[PDB]
Design a protein around this nucleic acid. Structure first.
Lengths: 226, 236
DNA sequence: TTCGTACGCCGTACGAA
DNA sequence: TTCGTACGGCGTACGAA
């Protein structure tokens, strides 16, 4: 079924994945097509298929590969708050570095490659110490993973949009001002209007915001532990 | 520009029969193909074929496919069955909103793929839906930026949970291999991973990952319940 | 193992009915 | 307003060296 059960038989899987990552970073996941990645290696297009069954598969391999960039200690430590914060910050760093992770990862089956499993051991590890049911642990970590991914999924959404359309967030908001006005005036959308200033140009910036929400989230996990 | 600033062309002035092809009609057909055979099928040719129209005839009403999908997104959000005012029971209000969104997403799995997550969708249906959600916590005396944070935490939980639920669904469509089946075929490899000894936590959590104790509905609710509890704490 | 050729998809530019 | 034709992409099946 999966690619971690389907091992490969210069040109190698490891070399194709690392090239696909390089194209994806440099020119966006849409550029990392079989021909372009093969061109990058000097290979024939279909030569890649000897090492990688399908493109869906190549992307899963791409996903695990980049996760391996994570700089994480072996043991999480006793400061679960600090541990989860670090894991969170490294993931955000990663995603910003590889914006295509939000698009590429189709979200069905979990990725059980080595790098993902290492990363997940660390996260699941932080709360393993405490006396909680398996299903409570998964819930609490789901809430954690949720906050981080969602926040970062938006951050990276704008980034990728900016690449494709050469129109960044300040610029998009600027050009929507007129229509926003119409919406505000319509009177049919009070809340939208109350919240527009902060939506267009936020008081505090992404780093500050990511931290606050994380801080709150961890606080609630703490409450759940008691 | 965006699409909510780019209306379909005015028809020529005439007392005689209208002529079928319109933006509203193209969107509704794209949604139907997307639901029936998955977003990948709802291509310009397939949607035109559905209407009996020529492929490029659609482009008179819709600038780009990226645009058609935004229109698709707002269209389906309009299916939300929601009261006008949210009510005083913010917990009840948010629960309902959450359940309806999940219901929606399960009904239109392509929402996870379609919605690219950059700029917000400022179509009518999205704005109505957002008014209701933002509304629930408007009553309380909180800074704009606190309100957005608290609602972001909410939207986070719901989307992430549902994004996985729907991930499996779509995968099952494409590969004809559902979740039970995938887990079943991964058993061997999970064994190897468990035995390796290099992944204790993975092993501790495998039974529940393969075949969960409680099911999606029960699980979605628990997490939501917890999430709301923390928002409650934040209000105090 | 390597890879050239080919098929059937896609979004959409162009220009005439 | 409609849309046929065409261009340059895509993933990948097939079959030959």
């Amino acid at each position: 079924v999966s690619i971690w059960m389907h091992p490969e038989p210069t040109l190698s899987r490891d070399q194709i994945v690392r090239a696909a990552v390089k194209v994806a970073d440099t020119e966006g996941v849409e550029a990392a097509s079989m021909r372009r990645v093969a061109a990058e290696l000097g290979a024939g297009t279909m030569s890649l298929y000897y090492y990688v069954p399908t493109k869906e598969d190549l992307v899963e391999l791409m996903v695990d590969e980049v996760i391996g960039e994570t700089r994480l200690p072996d043991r999480p430590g006793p400061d679960w708050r600090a541990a989860l914060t670090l894991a969170a910050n490294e993931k955000r760093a990663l995603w910003l570095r590889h914006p295509w992770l939000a698009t590429a990862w189709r979200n069905g089956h979990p990725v059980w490659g080595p790098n993902s499993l290492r990363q997940q051991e660390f996260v699941l590890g932080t709360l393993g110490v405490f006396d909680l049911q398996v299903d409570e642990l998964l819930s609490l970590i789901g809430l954690y993973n949720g906050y981080v991914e969602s926040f970062v999924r938006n951050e990276v959404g704008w980034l990728e949009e900016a690449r494709r359309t050469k129109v960044d967030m300040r610029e998009w908001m600027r050009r929507s001002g007129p229509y926003a006005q119409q919406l505000v005036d319509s009177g049919e959308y009070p809340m939208f209007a109350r919240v527009l200033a902060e939506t267009v140009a936020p008081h505090m910036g992404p780093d500050q915001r990511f931290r606050s929400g994380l801080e709150r989230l961890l606080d609630s996990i703490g409450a759940s532990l008691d």
